[PDB]
């Protein structure tokens, strides 16, 4: 019966033989402080007692990073904005964005450089924030959310696993290993990762996640494929179900939400109803990228993962910024289509589809920066108009919005009903009660130290690293198959490889990695060439209103067409405009003056929009916004210096479904592997034969740029193209002895 309580500001009070927290400091026990009652009564009693300002502060979630004290050397102190956020704007939801790791030696507190904090320091911080949260009138606790933290970047003190697609690769391979085919995967893998993730996240007081992504990799040109698990909706649905089950728990509430005091991380799945199918793979962070198009009519397939997660009881949902072009309303009259606005602002999507068609009973967390920079379809509207559109659309809380007064102003102008704010407040409080945060919101900082990156947890990560590796090609020489490596030999390395780790497996290693001026050693006479390569975008120079870039007619036009519901095409998106024209800094359609460029610098990722279909390595070499690392020119020199290319072994990281074009020569390598982020002991363990490769492609790889241009952004695979797939979904070799 009696749950554990902790209180740093308020007092505890003995009642009816049990203990309770006196969170309103009134000396008697309110129903909302009475953990014996079911959540609906505590919420109802709590909302009853809340100011108009208290209820609307819940509808904000913003960054609240740990700071350091430059005079004391202490890390994990509140920043300056904490006071204004918790006391003035009455916020209880934050995004924690610091890296968690051991700081190198000599690293002292600077100022305002979002510091790296240790596990104990991070928990110190979130405890401090809860202490200030408890200091409010009603002592409502806070929830922190964060983007993912347990994936290698080709980190911190969080246990390192491969990237999302790498986890699916491991799950497909483990199914194949034990059954024979790779369809929906073996979720024992997924559960193991999520279990390590849960304990580590909860141990530092981080109980929410902006994620995981339920999006599908159906458009290889979408830069966000790097955070996608698969292109297969049905595999996606099983991973989502498993993530929710492991991270949130399997006890649902009467309301159908997987929420309990043992819920370690409540998920806010994203990006509803599916960020994947982007026209030309252009991303709707950017004005040119507003469109989501569905040539194969797969809109329903893309939200299957969300239905799986909703049915398992996901806590929260983030709609995307995209605009669903010409998409039949689900469960609606023939001919009816969803509004040509960003999902976050379309009531038919956040209330129609999500809640009435799909049955979701939780809250809706907007994506970040919609009201000011990305209210697609509301380019003309004002900010209060945009806020009201989202809230009345069904969004309950706004990420990156920090002026509570605007919400209150809209209520006092009857632009938002009080029932609606009450309805938000209800949905936002429900998880906090169920997750036990009204009983104890604190954590032990010593225990984060023993938890984040514990040896056993990193063991699970290394296990998944080795099972994520996909072996795509393995020439059979006259001396046998290229992989596994024979013992000993001269090995040439190119690309990010730690020489000592390769060397410790018994090879004498030449390093082809040199500074830009220095003379690269030749590769001739090597027994093995280990190349580790990838492709990266370098588009920081993009500017929407530069006649050399965004408004350069020599860069083509934006074939994307979104006809607004005012009967008009949206600016820059009529089908014959310059790439930079969709940006507000060109069309100016805002109620503002001399507006700034949203798209400048392409800070979030992605190539120049006119280069987004260049996924073949030879093109990427020659492109302006693409860089092959290491240079394809260096690789080709190296693959020649060894006169048999069967001695070459390519570890490729497929950040996006890159295309090994036949002209590049990379298919001449003796073995090709797809890695999804792994340490070099993991990679060398597999290469030298200590473990055999078992992962399977969680997405298909094409062998022609042409197939990239023809494929259907909403459709998996390349089976509908003239050239087809180089490697299908679910492919992967092993060794056989």
- Rounded to the nearest 5°, which phi and psi values hold at 716? -75, 155
Cβ atoms of 442 and 130 within 8 Å: the answer is: yes
Q: Smallest distance from the beta carbon of 531 to ligand C3G, in angstroms?
A: 27
The nearest distance, CB 724 to Zn ion, in angstroms, is: 11
- Chain positions 71 to 100 lying near ligand C3G, rule: CB under 6 A, are 95
CB of 554 to Zn ion, least distance (A): 4
Q: Give min distance, CB of 421 to ligand C3G, in A.
A: 23
Contact (CB, 8 A) for 29 and 14: no
Residues 191-230 that bind ligand C3G (CB under 6 A): 210
Considering only residues 384 through 413, tell me which ones interact with ligand C3G, judged by CB under 6 A.
399
* Distance in angstroms (rounded) separating the CA atoms of residues 515 and 204: 41
Pairing mode, if any, of strands 323-324 and 528-537?
unpaired
To ligand C3G, the closest distance from the beta carbon of 621 in angstroms equals: 24
The interface with ligand C3G within residues 343-382 (CB under 6 A) comprises 367-368
696 binds, among Zn ion, ligand C3G, none (CB under 5 to 8 A by kind): none
- Given ligand C3G, Zn ion, none, residue 605, with its beta carbon under 5 to 8 Å by kind, binds ligand C3G
**143, containing H or E segment:** strand 143-145
24, interface contact from ligand C3G, Zn ion, none, CB < 5-8 Å by kind: Zn ion
User: 239 near 171, Cβ under 8 Å?
Assistant: yes
Residues lying near Zn ion in the complex (CB under 5 A) are found at 16, 22, 24, 26, 30, 33, 54, 90, 140, 218, 278-279, 282, 289, 291, 454, 508, 554, 711-712, 715
The 3-state DSSP composition of the chain as helix, strand, coil percent (nearest 5) reads 35, 15, 50
Query: What residues between 273 and 302 interact with ligand C3G by CB under 6 A?
Result: 285
- In the bound state with Zn ion, the residue whose beta carbon lies nearer, of 275 and 693, is 275
- Of 8 and 603, the one with the shorter C-beta distance to ligand C3G is 603
Q: Residue 366 corresponds to which tokens in the numbers above?
A: 């907007």
- Binding to ligand C3G, residues 251-270 (CB under 6 A): 270
Q: Look at residue 147 and give the partner it binds from ligand C3G, Zn ion, none, a contact being a CB closer than 5 to 8 Å depending on partner kind.
A: ligand C3G
Q: Which helix (H) or strand (E) holds 596?
A: none
Q: Closer to Zn ion at the Cβ: 145 or 224?
A: 224
CB-wise, 208 or 693, nearer to Zn ion? 208
Residue with tokens 């893309």: 302
With a CB cutoff of 8 Å and minimum separation 6, the contacts of 519 are: none
Closest distance between ligand C3G and the C-beta of residue 224, in Å?
A: 7
- Please provide residue 492's backbone torsions phi and psi, each rounded to the nearest 5 degrees: -95, 135
The sheet that has 316-319: what strands, in order across it?
143-145, 93-95, 60-63, 397-399, 363-368, 316-319, 266-272, 208-213
- Contact partner at residue 604 from ligand C3G, Zn ion, none, CB < 5 to 8 Å by partner kind: ligand C3G
Q: Distance from CA of residue 440 to its chain's centroid?
A: 29
Residue 458's binding partner, choosing from Zn ion, ligand C3G, none, with beta-carbon cut-off 5 to 8 A by kind? none
CB 522 within 8 A of CB 581: no
Beta bridge partner(s), residue 649: 530, 671
Of 132-161, which residues contact ligand C3G (CB under 6 A)?
A: 147
β 75-77/67-68 pair status: antiparallel
Residue closest to Zn ion when measured from CB atoms: 289
Shortest distance in whole angstroms from residue 392 CB to ligand C3G: 22
Residue 227 or 439 having the CB closest to ligand C3G? 227
Any idea what DSSP says for residue 435? T
Q: Segment 600-659, which members bind ligand C3G (CB under 6 A)?
A: 604-605
DSSP-H helix ranges across 452-559? 455-468, 499-504
Judged by CB, which is closer to ligand C3G: 214, or 494? 214
Nearer to ligand C3G, 221 or 270 (CB): 270
The least distance separating ligand C3G from the CB of residue 46, rounded to whole angstroms, comes to: 27
With a CB cutoff of 8 Å and minimum separation 6, the contacts of 150 are 158, 159, 160, 161, 193, 196, 197, 200, 461
90 binds, among ligand C3G, Zn ion, none (CB under 5 to 8 A by kind): Zn ion
Say how far apart CA 116 and CA 103 lie, in whole Å: 7
- Taking the C-alpha atoms of residue 117 and residue 98, their distance in angstroms, rounded to an integer, is 7
The residues that touch ligand C3G, with contacts defined as CB under 6 A, are 95, 147, 210, 270, 285, 367-368, 399, 604-605
């Amino acid at each position: 019966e009696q749950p554990e309580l902790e209180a740093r500001v308020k007092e505890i009070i003995e009642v009816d033989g049990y203990q309770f927290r006196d969170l309103n400091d009134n000396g008697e026990l309110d129903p909302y402080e009475d953990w014996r009652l079911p959540t609906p009564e505590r919420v109802a009693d709590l909302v009853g007692q809340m100011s108009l300002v208290e209820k609307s502060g819940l509808m904000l979630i913003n960054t609240l990073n740990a700071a350091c004290d430059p005079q004391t050397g202490e890390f994990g102190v509140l920043p300056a904005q904490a006071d204004n956020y918790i006391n003035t704007q009455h916020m209880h939801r934050f995004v924690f964005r610091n890296v968690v790791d051991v700081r190198a030696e000599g690293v002292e507190c600077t100022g305002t450089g979002t510091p790296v904090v240790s596990p104990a320091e991070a928990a110190t911080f979130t405890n401090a924030v809860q202490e200030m949260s408890e200091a409010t009138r009603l002592g409502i606790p806070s929830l922190f959310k964060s983007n993912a933290r347990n994936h290698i970047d080709p980190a911190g003190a969080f246990s390192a696993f491969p990237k999302e697609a790498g986890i699916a690769a491991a799950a497909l391979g483990e199914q194949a290993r034990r059954t024979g085919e790779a369809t929906t995967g073996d979720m024992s893998v997924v559960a193991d990762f999520a279990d390590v993730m849960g304990e580590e996240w909860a141990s530092i007081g981080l109980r929410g996640m902006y994620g995981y992504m339920a999006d599908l990799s159906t458009e290889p040109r979408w830069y966000r494929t790097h955070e996608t698990f698969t292109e297969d909706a049905y595999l996606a649905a099983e991973i989502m179900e498993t993530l929710v089950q492991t991270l949130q728990g399997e006890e649902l509430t009467d309301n159908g939400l997987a929420l309990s005091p043992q819920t370690r991380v409540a998920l806010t799945l994203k990006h509803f109803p599916g960020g994947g199918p982007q026209e030309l793979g252009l991303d709707p962070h950017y004005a040119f990228g507003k469109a989501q198009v569905y040539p194969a009519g797969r809109f329903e397939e893309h939200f299957l993962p969300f239905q799986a997660a909703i049915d398992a009881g996901v806590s929260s949902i983030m709609p995307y910024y995209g605009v669903p072009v010409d998409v039949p309303v689900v469960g609606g009259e023939p001919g009816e289509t969803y509004p040509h606005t960003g999902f976050a602002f379309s009531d038919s999507i956040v209330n129609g589809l999500l809640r009435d068609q799909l049955g979701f009973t939780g809250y809706v967390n907007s994506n970040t920066g919609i009201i000011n920079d990305r209210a697609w379809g509301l380019e003309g509207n004002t900010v209060p108009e945009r806020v009201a559109a989202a809230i009345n659309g069904g969004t309950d809380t706004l990420s990156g919005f920090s002026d509570v007064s605007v919400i209150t102003d809209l209520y006092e102008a009857d632009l938002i009903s009080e029932e609606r704010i009450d309805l938000a407040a209800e949905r936002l409080l429900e998880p906090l009660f169920d997750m036990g945060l009204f009983e104890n919101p604190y954590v032990d900082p010593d225990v984060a130290t023993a938890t984040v990156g514990a040896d056993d947890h990193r063991a699970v990560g290394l296990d998944l690293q080795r099972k994520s590796l996909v072996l795509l090609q393995n020439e059979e020489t006259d001396e046998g198959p290229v992989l596994p490596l024979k013992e000993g030999g001269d090995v040439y390395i190119l690309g990010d490889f730690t020489e000592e780790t390769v060397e410790s497996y018994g090879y004498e290693v030449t390093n082809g990695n040199v500074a830009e001026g220095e003379e690269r050693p030749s590769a001739a006479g090597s027994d093995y060439v280990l190349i580790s390569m990838t492709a990266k975008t370098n588009a920081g120079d993009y500017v929407s209103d530069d006649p050399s870039l965004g408004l350069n007619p020599d860069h083509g036009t934006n074939p994307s067409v979104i006809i607004g519901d005012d009967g008009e095409p949206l600016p820059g998106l009529d089908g014959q405009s310059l790439w930079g024209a969709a940006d507000v800094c060109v069309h100016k359609e805002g109620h503002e003056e001399n507006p700034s460029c949203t798209d400048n610098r392409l800070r979030f990722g992605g190539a120049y929009p006119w280069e987004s279909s260049i996924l073949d390595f030879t093109g990427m070499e020659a492109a302006e916004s693409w860089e092959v690392v290491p240079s394809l020119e260096t690789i080709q020199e190296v693959m020649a210096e060894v006169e048999d290319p069967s001695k070459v072994i390519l570890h490729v990281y497929f950040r996006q479904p890159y295309v090994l074009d036949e002209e590049s020569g990379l298919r001449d390598a003796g073995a090709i592997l797809a890695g999804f982020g792994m340490t070099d002991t993991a990679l060398m363990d597999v290469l030298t034969g200590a473990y055999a490769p078992q992962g399977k492609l969680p997405f298909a790889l094409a062998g022609t740029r042409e197939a990239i241009i023809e494929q259907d952004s909403d459709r998996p695979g390349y089976d509908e193209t003239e050239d087809g797939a180089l490697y299908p979904f679910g492919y992967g070799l092993t060794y056989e002895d």
